[PDB]
From a paper:
In this paper, we present the complex crystal structure between rat transcobalamin (rTC) and GSCbl. We obtained crystals of rTC that diffracted to 1.2 Å resolution at pH 5.5 in the presence of GSH and to our surprise we observed continuous electron density emanating from the Co of the Cbl ring system corresponding to GSH. GSH binds at the β-axial site, located between Cbl and the α-domain of rTC. Therefore, most interactions are formed with residues located in the α-domain. The Co–S bond is approximately 2.4 Å, the Co–dimethylbenzimidazole base bond is 2.2 Å and the corrin fold angle is 6.6°, which is defined as the butterfly angle between N21, C4, C5, C6, N22 C9, C10, and C10, C11, N23, C14, C15, C16, and N24. The majority of the 14 polar interactions between GSH and rTC are formed through solvent molecules. However, direct side chain interactions are present between Ser195, Thr198, and GSH. The strongest interaction is found between the α-helix dipole of α6 (Tyr154 and Tyr155), which interacts with the carboxylate of the γ-glutamate group of GSH. When the β site of Cbl is occupied by a strong ligand such as cyanide or GSH, the TC α7/α8 loop is disordered (bovine TC) or folds outward into the solvent (rat and human TC) and forms little hydrogen bonds with the rest of the protein. Our structure of rTC in complex with GSCbl clearly displays the broad specificity of TC concerning β groups of Cbl.
Author numbering: 15 to 85, 95 to 120, 124 to 427
The structure:
């Protein structure tokens, strides 16, 4: 590739990548319906690493869970979650399909298309991220959806719906590009083909323009999906752009990034030069090294002082607490709660605990609790993974989606 047209990530530190995989390994034993994440299975299968027989047991439990929750299930499965399960099936070389899951995912897309409306003036009940992910998951199972469904996602890309105040929301843009790439390879939605092929170029160009001087695309956690999109096909400047991203990824791993299992599961494929598009026709005898358990570090003795602020409740709340150095924001919330007259609530997600209430105020429709480093810098990690530094002030703020 003397011309530098292929997006590659060469010469990654072997032990940083091993340790990244070892962070997923313990999660292979968390098999309850409340903790299963099909993206973990996909990410491991597309990676240079494996967990042996634990993978087969994980897939067995995924199958029982998604089969039980088709419309003894406990919580309603979103379209995107079912889509990730479809990706897990392809990672084991299994093909669906009148399949009930295929139909359920198609009807999810129909519901979201209706929410968006004929004038693209509405919004999905979930997100354009889940919309694109669901189109992609159907496509890799060789299943087409109606042009009217695909048109909504094309329109959003064509009208730059995922750029806000000049900043591209890279993850959703990249996911849309992955879906479009799959449609193009099957020649699905052929009446939309010129739009599809241009939109692939638009996504790639917008991703490249979102590259920061440091080398990440948007932010370090959007970079895995951005790299998937760039790796689907060679292009001018991709070699050089992806070498900058390599530098950013290495520095981030050295600095302790990528603790979150969902994020690890998005990064592992691209470190192995694979993407979700490999799930059309995947190698199911891929070369992968067995992971072994990491050794856990000694107890952290130092402490950090962190101020927790909530101004979207009446009366507002502010308290400085101390926790062990390396404790999470969740630990800070727990310490504040222990000190009295502070409460919070969460719900499970495939990314871990999602903050849903603070001081008795539950996020309503189209609202969420945003986590910020004062002043006004949104955190890049959620409560379980963000580790506050001494002297930081963290704000919880209820905002409109
Ligand atoms: C859509 C989305 C949101 C929406 C979710 C609501 C909706 N309308 O669906 C909104 C805008 C509310 C949101 C909020 C946040 N998000 Co967000 N989000 C995403 C996105 C684009 C897609 C998620 C999705 O649908 N996945 C597919 C479905 C099937 O999976 P799921 O687990 O069932 O989806 C749920 C969770 O993702 C959850 N949620 C969304 N984001 C986050 C982040 C964390 C850490 C957790 C625990 C949960 C959570 O909401 C989804 C719907 O219920 C991802 C992109 C990505 N690369 O994954 C980023 C992403 C997951 N979010 C991220 C972050 C950091 C946040 C926030 C912490 C930002 C902040 N500073 O407040 C908050 C969450 C705080 C809290 N209250 O706990 C990061 C996480 C990185 C990491 N290291 O883990 C990502 C990767 C984006 C990025 N590149 O920065 N998010
Ligand atoms: N509107 C988009 C989602 C945009 C979005 O919620 N982006 C959040 C996700 S946490 C974000 O701030 N992303 C980081 C960024 O844009 O840099 C969709 O429908 O998929
Ligand atoms: Cl992380
Ligand atoms: Cl609460």
């Amino acid at each position: 590739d003397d011309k530098g047209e292929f997006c590659v990530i060469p010469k990654m530190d072997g032990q940083l990548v091993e340790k990244l995989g070892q962070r997923l390994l313990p999660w292979m034993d968390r098999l309850s319906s409340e903790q299963l994440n099909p993206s973990i299975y996909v990410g491991l299968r597309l990676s240079s690493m494996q967990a042996g027989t634990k993978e087969n047991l994980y897939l067995h439990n995924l199958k029982l869970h998604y089969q039980q929750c088709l419309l003894g299930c406990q919580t309603k499965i979103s379209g995107g979650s079912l889509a990730l399960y479809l990706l897990a099936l392809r990672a084991n070389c299994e093909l669906l399909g009148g399949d009930r899951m295929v139909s359920q995912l198609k009807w999810f897309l129909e519901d979201e298309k209706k929410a968006i409306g004929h004038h693209h003036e509405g919004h999905p009940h979930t997100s354009y991220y889940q919309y694109g992910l669901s189109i992609l998951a159907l496509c890799v199972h060789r299943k087409r959806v109606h042009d009217s469904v695909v048109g909504k996602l094309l329109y959003a890309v064509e009208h730059d719906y995922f750029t806000y105040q000049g900043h591209l929301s890279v993850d959703t843009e990249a996911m849309a590009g992955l879906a479009f790439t799959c449609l193009e390879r099957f020649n699905f939605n052929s009446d939309l083909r010129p739009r599809i092929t241009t939109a692939i170029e638009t996504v790639r160009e917008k991703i490249l323009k979102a590259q920061a001087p440091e080398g990440y695309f948007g932010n370090i956690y959007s970079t895995p999906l951005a790299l998937q999109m760039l790796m689907t096909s060679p292009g001018v400047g991709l070699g050089p752009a992806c070498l900058k991203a390599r530098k950013s990824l290495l520095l981030s791993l050295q600095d302790g990034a990528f603790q979150n299992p969902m994020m690890i599961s998005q990064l592992l494929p691209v470190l192995n030069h694979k993407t979700y598009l490999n799930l059309i026709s995947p190698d199911c005898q891929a070369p992968r090294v067995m992971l072994v358990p990491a050794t856990e570090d000694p107890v952290h003795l130092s402490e950090v002082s962190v101020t927790l602020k909530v101004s979207s409740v009446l009366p507002p709340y502010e308290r400085t607490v101390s926790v062990f150095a390396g404790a999470s924001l969740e630990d800070v919330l727990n310490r504040a709660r222990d000190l009295g007259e502070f409460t919070y609530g969460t719900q499970a997600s495939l990314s871990g605990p999602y903050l849903t209430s603070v001081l008795g105020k539950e996020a309503g429709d189209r609202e969420y609790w945003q986590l910020l480093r004062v002043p006004d810098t949104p955190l890049l990690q959620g409560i379980a993974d963000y580790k506050p530094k001494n002297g930081e002030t963290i704000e919880l703020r209820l905002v409109k989606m």
